Amino acid sequence: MQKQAELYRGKAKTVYSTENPDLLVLEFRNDTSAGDGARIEQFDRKGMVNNKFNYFIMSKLAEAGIPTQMERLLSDTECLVKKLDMVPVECVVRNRAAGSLVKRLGIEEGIELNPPLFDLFLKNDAMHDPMVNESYCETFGWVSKENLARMKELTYKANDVLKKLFDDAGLILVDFKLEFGLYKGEVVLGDEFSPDGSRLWDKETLEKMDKDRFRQSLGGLIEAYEAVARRLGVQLD
Amino acid sequence: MQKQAELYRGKAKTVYSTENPDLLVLEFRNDTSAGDGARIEQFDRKGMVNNKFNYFIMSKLAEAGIPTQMERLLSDTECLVKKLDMVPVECVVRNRAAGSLVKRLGIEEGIELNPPLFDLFLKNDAMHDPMVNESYCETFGWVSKENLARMKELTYKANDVLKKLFDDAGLILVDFKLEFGLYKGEVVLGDEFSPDGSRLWDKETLEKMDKDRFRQSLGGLIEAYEAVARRLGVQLD
Numbered sequence: 505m506q507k508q509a510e511l512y513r514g515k516a517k518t519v520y521s522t523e524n525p526d527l528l529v530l531e532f533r534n535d536t537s538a539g540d541g542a543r544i545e546q547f548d549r550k551g552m553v554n555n556k557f558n559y560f561i562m563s564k565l566a567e568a569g570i571p572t573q574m575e576r577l578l579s580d581t582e583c584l585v586k587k588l589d590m591v592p593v594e595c596v597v598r599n600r601a602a603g604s605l606v607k608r609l610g611i612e613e614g615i616e617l618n619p620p621l622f623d624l625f626l627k628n629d630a631m632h633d634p635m636v637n638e639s640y641c642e643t644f645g646w647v648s649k650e651n652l653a654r655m656k657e658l659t660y661k662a663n664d665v666l667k668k669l670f671d672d673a674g675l676i677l678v679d680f681k682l683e684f685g686l687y688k689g690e691v692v693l694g695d696e697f698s699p700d701g702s703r704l705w706d707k708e709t710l711e712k713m714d715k716d717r718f719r720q721s722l723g724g725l726i727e728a729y730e731a732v733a734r735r736l737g738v739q740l741d
Numbered sequence: 742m743q744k745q746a747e748l749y750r751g752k753a754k755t756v757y758s759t760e761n762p763d764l765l766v767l768e769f770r771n772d773t774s775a776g777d778g779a780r781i782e783q784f785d786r787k788g789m790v791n792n793k794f795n796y797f798i799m800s801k802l803a804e805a806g807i808p809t810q811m812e813r814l815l816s817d818t819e820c821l822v823k824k825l826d827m828v829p830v831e832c833v834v835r836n837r838a839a840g841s842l843v844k845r846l847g848i849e850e851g852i853e854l855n856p857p858l859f860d861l862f863l864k865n866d867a868m869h870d871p872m873v874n875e876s877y878c879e880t881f882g883w884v885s886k887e888n889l890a891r892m893k894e895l896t897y898k899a900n901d902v903l904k905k906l907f908d909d910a911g912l913i914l915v916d917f918k919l920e921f922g923l924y925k926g927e928v929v930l931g932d933e934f935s936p937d938g939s940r941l942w943d944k945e946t947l948e949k950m951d952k953d954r955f956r957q958s959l960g961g962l963i964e965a966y967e968a969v970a971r972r973l974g975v976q977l978d
């Protein structure tokens with residue numbers, strides 16, 4: 505299985521078709537966007553780190569029983585995945601207050617959330633990914649009630665699994681975003697899990713080591729990404 | 742019954758205590774606030790119209806079986822109500838796209854929503870009443886799952902009842918906002934139902950006859966409120 509032609513691309517990955525109608529090639533680019541204003545910069549090794557970081561996390565979730573898109577890595581920046589009919593809704597679980605929650609509610613960053621919060625955002629850059637809820641999914645036909653329930657279920661399961669994984673690595677899983685899609689009628693985890701869409705703080709110093717370093721221009725973005733990879737045991741070289 | 746002391750006030754009503762610890766007096770002022778930028782304006786007869794308008798609707802909802810705060814009207818602008826431990830979350834049902842939905846999702850105003858949408862907003866002027874969801878209610882303890890389910894159940898019932906009532910009066914109930922509180926542990930409809938928090942369009946011309954006339958500089962606010970009141974059978978003078 506090799507890339508055939510580019511079908512489409514997003515702000516971080518390029519999607520290619522393959523000879524198989526049910527398999528695609530995801531290419532992680534070095535592109536790094538930010539804010540609703542959207543400012544993009546390229547960071548060396550970024551795509552490769554996220555691709556391998558994603559494979560590692562996806563496998564951990566699969567081992568836990570989470571059905572995923574993953575087939576296998578193809579190169580430093582590419583992987584083979586099942587073609588999914590993506591539900592255009594981001595699922596965000598928050599263990600501590602940060603990002604848009606802090607901006608939206610004016611709550612103090614870092615506040616522990618018990619139980620964790622669960623946000624749903626419609627994927628629409630034009631509208632800056634507006635917040636939605638279950639009624640919207642039904643009314644606009646984005647996903648069935650049964651499938652949405654499954655998505656939330658798998659997200660919370662992923663949260664339980666990953667909070668433990670990151671804790672063992674001396675990290676706090678502040679929050680993260682997931683995207684699911686349908687594969688032959690079944691809900692499957694797709695897209696990616698990396699520091700781009702998940703917040704990770706050092707357990708002892710609370711130092712931010714995810715995309716917030718880029719959003720807040722704190723410097724050392726990729727250095728932080730690789731630091732996290734090393735703590736988890738993700739081979740990069 | 743008589744007002745004993747002003748407890749507090751919001752942007753449209755003043756809340757007073759009475760000699761009875763379980764009863765309050767609500768005064769509907771002529772104060773009208775549009776745009777969180779609090780561009781207040783006073784409209785003569787506004788308080789009186791909404792007080793009578795609210796009484797009429799609450800009475801209809803009560804007949805339908807919905808528990809409400811209403812005891813009786815004390816004057817043209819005041820009403821005697823049960824003291825409720827208000828849940829700080831607005832419940833909004835949308836039958837057609839309008840207001841913030843249009844600006845939020847970029848959907849065309851007027852589009853019919855099937856099934857209707859249901860929004861939850863945290864009451865917080867400083868933060869412009871940010872949108873929330875059920876997980877927020879549990880995490881921050883604004884209201885239990887059981888009571889929230891009850892609030893939504895009653896809001897949907899109010900929708901079935903009021904859509905018919907307004908249609909009979911040649912009007913389209915576009916959307917509306919309700920607020921509930923607890924009375925000795927039970928969920929009870931409180932606050933108010935008026936053109937201030939509900940969108941109503943003439944069934945034949947679609948002319949707006951609610952607070953949107955003030956929000957969107959169309960003028961004729963009170964004249965519209967009175968026209969709606971009279972169509973419902975409310976005698977204003």
Ligand SMILES: Nc1ncnc2c1ncn2[C@@H]1O[C@H](COP(=O)(O)OP(=O)(O)O)[C@@H](O)[C@H]1O
Nearest residue numbers: 513514515516517573585586587588590694695
């Ligand atoms: N397994 C998959 N099958 C099909 N599409 C997928 C799969 N995994 C991810 N996608 C989609 O491919 C795109 C990946 O690109 P990305 O640059 O992250 O986009 P975005 O700008 O929306 O963040 C997204 O639209 C995502 O939903």
Ligand SMILES: Nc1ncnc2c1ncn2[C@@H]1O[C@H](COP(=O)(O)OP(=O)(O)O)[C@@H](O)[C@H]1O
Nearest residue numbers: 751752753754756810822823824825827931932
């Ligand atoms: N029956 C009631 N018991 C107690 N508080 C009530 C009752 N009905 C309404 N309230 C509260 O009193 C206030 C009425 O004020 P209003 O001017 O509409 O406020 P706001 O500026 O928040 O819209 C609101 O905070 C409302 O929740």
Ligand SMILES: [Mg+2]
Nearest residue numbers: 514515516695
């Ligand atoms: Mg993406």
Ligand SMILES: [Mg+2]
Nearest residue numbers: 751752753932
């Ligand atoms: Mg109010």
